Ligand binder design. Sequence first.
Ligand code: HEM
Ligand code: HEM
Ligand SMILES: CC(C)(C)OC(=O)N[C@H](CS[C@H](Cc1ccccc1)C(=O)NCCCc1cccnc1)Cc1ccccc1
Ligand SMILES: CC(C)(C)OC(=O)N[C@H](CS[C@H](Cc1ccccc1)C(=O)NCCCc1cccnc1)Cc1ccccc1
Lengths: 441, 454
Amino acid sequence: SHGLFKKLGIPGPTPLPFLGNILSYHKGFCMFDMECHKKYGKVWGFYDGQQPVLAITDPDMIKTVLVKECYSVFTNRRPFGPVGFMKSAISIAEDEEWKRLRSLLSPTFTSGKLKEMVPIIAQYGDVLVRNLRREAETGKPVTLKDVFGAYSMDVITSTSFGVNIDPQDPFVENTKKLLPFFLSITVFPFLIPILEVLNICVFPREVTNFLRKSVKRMKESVDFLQLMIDSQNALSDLELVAQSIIFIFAGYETTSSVLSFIMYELATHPDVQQKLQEEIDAVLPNKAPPTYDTVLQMEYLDMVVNETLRLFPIAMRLERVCKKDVEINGMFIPKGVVVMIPSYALHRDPKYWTEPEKFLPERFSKKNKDNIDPYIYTPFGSGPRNCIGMRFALMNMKLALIRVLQNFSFKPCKETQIPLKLSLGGLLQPEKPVVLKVESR
Amino acid sequence: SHGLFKKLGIPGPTPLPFLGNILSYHKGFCMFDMECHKKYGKVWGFYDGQQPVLAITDPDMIKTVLVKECYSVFTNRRPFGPVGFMKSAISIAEDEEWKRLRSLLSPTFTSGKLKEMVPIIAQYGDVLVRNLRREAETGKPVTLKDVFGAYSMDVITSTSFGVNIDSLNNPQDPFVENTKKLLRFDFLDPFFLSITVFPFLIPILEVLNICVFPREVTNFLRKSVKRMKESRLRVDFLQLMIDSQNALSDLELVAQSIIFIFAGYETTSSVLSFIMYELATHPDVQQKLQEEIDAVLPNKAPPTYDTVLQMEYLDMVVNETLRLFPIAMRLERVCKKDVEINGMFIPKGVVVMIPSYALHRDPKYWTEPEKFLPERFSKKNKDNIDPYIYTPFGSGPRNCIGMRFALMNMKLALIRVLQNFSFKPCKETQIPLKLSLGGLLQPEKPVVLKVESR
Ligand code: HEM
Ligand code: HEM
Ligand SMILES: CC(C)(C)OC(=O)N[C@H](CS[C@H](Cc1ccccc1)C(=O)NCCCc1cccnc1)Cc1ccccc1
Ligand SMILES: CC(C)(C)OC(=O)N[C@H](CS[C@H](Cc1ccccc1)C(=O)NCCCc1cccnc1)Cc1ccccc1
């Protein structure tokens, strides 16, 4: 099954038996995609075990997979298991059950519901300034992911459940240890049903048994939880827990990690951090509380977040599974081949970005954003199955950037890893934690 | 009220009672703004009747009005009336209504939407080449405004509604004949010179259902858009308004559609006629432009989205023509509260105007400003260009929302036409071109040129 790409005339690295091309992951998913982006061109194919993975870079072919042929061919992602009861997760759901869950959780982040969340986040924006003021009056380098993780945990637990959880909070402690052995599932896809019918999972039982019991305590009979009960009156009780774990993890690990990526760039680029503080003071003088209209008005704030998401796409890749024999843009893709879109390799392609290594917010300016292909820059994906919490994540991260830059400035320390080396492992994280100096204003 | 600029120490022509400085418009908006820019300097003020109009020319002062203090101070334009139900149009909406309509219509011209419209425009390009070939085999000078307006009406009606109204031409198509008379602003006509100068005459006409647009063209466009709703039966301009309606009104949908139909017809065809006039009067520029198209698109290759963005000299010819002929001429903003920008106090109610025509021909910014030199916008010299002195589409949140669509439709026309034909002047070609001394930016005599095939 490894002579597939040799047959279709699609180039790619020579796979090893059983392992495939996984031994080339020693530098990471991103480094392997960039090396293959230069070695083989625009389209190459490699193997994750015996699972054939086809990488595409043509924007027209990307649009056909993500947007056009979504409900017809490229509907589901790579089968991920064993998950146990977490099979009902919208991020892992497939075919008809996904459309029911996607349409059930879509009204969670409308412009009206997002406008209601601004006063809720405005409360947590003050405790963030107060806790950072303690670490500002005392010369101590701040572990940013720590305090941002506490801020990111309160937002998603309040804007989705209405419950207040407020340094050793058992949620942040449990939600973080979903962070190895997967090396086997890529090589034993047949061991996935070995653990399904016999009920074995990959997620630790304690992080699920706690969250399953916490959602039941949350079931105090318009929120993200209130939508799932009104739609129940068909939604199951165990399916309700699976969607909460995805929202709790996405609201904590994604927002806080990107916020840590933004502060590092602003501290390592003083003129960029200064120009952003001046704009924030202009739109919001006297440290005025931010509103939904003032968040979208700050364009340089949007140009900074879009540039950081370009350099640091936490998802790195985009995966879709071809469910039947099709031919898109004059290229045949067999059934079962996982079509992959290297977001990291395309965000730093020298043939689409000038100086793709450096932090230049001028790329996303309204003067220059017309030269950016929306299918090359995909930090949240695209199509009907993109990031459903995209507008919620962009709002929460900007609310933290506004409320903090009004009161503090960020400078590098001695222990600040400059340049920031990304973790050579799996998910997109720095090797050493992001620590910076905080000075009051 | 005519002593406002005397109080603020701002220069300007002495106004007359009631009329103000309107009588200096005997040569037009452009000649008046250029005479004031040379006599009074960087900042001057005049009166459109009793309405004080402050003209600014400083790049930092223009950037503050158009970009910086947009949502807070300079958000709306001069009140234009009587318009009737057309007050809900995005170009005339004010404050929260415009902010709701602007975000509602911005996804119409994204990079993906414009790339979807290329195969649709490519269809009408072949019809344009065919009609230009009939008047080319026979030695007959062509009124470019006619053949480009029909092409501009085909493109904007299909890419925004999905309906094909003009077919094979049809030199008596109703849309072009009704849209060309939608609004013909003239000073020699009293009605406009009657208002403009006096604003205590707008609310009377509103209660009489009197509008600046004739009822014949509004009642037709009211039923034409209503007939243009065919669902159940793509995602275009019409599809965006209905999906956002499911709070958009029904008559508000026709209001925004009338603006898109007019802008797609008048702006695209008028600038194209200005471009072809410079190409015929400068065969070297037309030759050098034809060689670039043959290099990117050999053997008459069909133009695509990516190949259009590659032609630099095509972008340089369009930019220099838009410099010599800014169809908007002016950029006006209303100061809604007392402010002090760049060390200058501006009272509330004063209309801040940016003379785009006078700035595009300023000798202290452009070397030989009256000469057609596309080399000004070359990558060697484009860095020596201030983006707030050359504003053919405005700047800031309330700029031309159809800028990237207009630039594409004109280039897609220039490519497919120059691939097959060359343009030369005639006996009846007005050389030099005299601009209309009236209101809107048009030539006096229509641009007529001979069409030779290749
Ligand atoms: C900087 C922050 C975030 C980034 C960059 C991000 C990125 C992404 C990406 C790339 C995808 C896949 C798109 C595709 O496959 O085409 C995705 C899916 C998803 N995102 Fe996010 N995300 C972020 C934050 C969030 C947040 C705060 C939530 C809150 C609920 C969330 C919920 C989801 C869900 C549920 C999915 C799966 C959707 C589906 O399977 O239909 N994400 N995200
Ligand atoms: C060569 C072609 C065109 C030129 C030079 C041009 C120029 C301009 C200028 C200078 C403005 C005012 C900007 C400001 O005040 O800051 C404007 C506004 C506008 N233009 Fe155009 N335009 C062109 C074609 C088009 C097209 C094709 C459309 C299609 C819809 C369009 C729709 C509009 C609208 C709706 C506004 C008002 C925007 C608002 O009020 O928010 N224009 N145009
Ligand atoms: C990396 C590897 C090989 C291990 O496999 C993936 O884990 N890969 C996913 C498949 S299942 C994933 C598992 C999971 C993780 C944490 C908690 C619960 C389940 C999953 O459901 N996570 C949804 C998290 C929400 C989120 C996270 C980041 C950005 N936005 C939203 C495929 C996938 C990757 C990235 C985005 C969406 C889907
Ligand atoms: C000569 C005078 C007084 C009229 O003076 C202006 O022309 N002044 C406008 C004010 S109302 C204008 C009226 C109108 C005209 C024709 C059809 C419908 C309404 C208006 O709304 N037309 C929008 C047309 C779209 C367009 C036209 C040209 C370029 N792009 C887009 C203020 C104004 C000027 C320039 C751009 C936008 C607004």
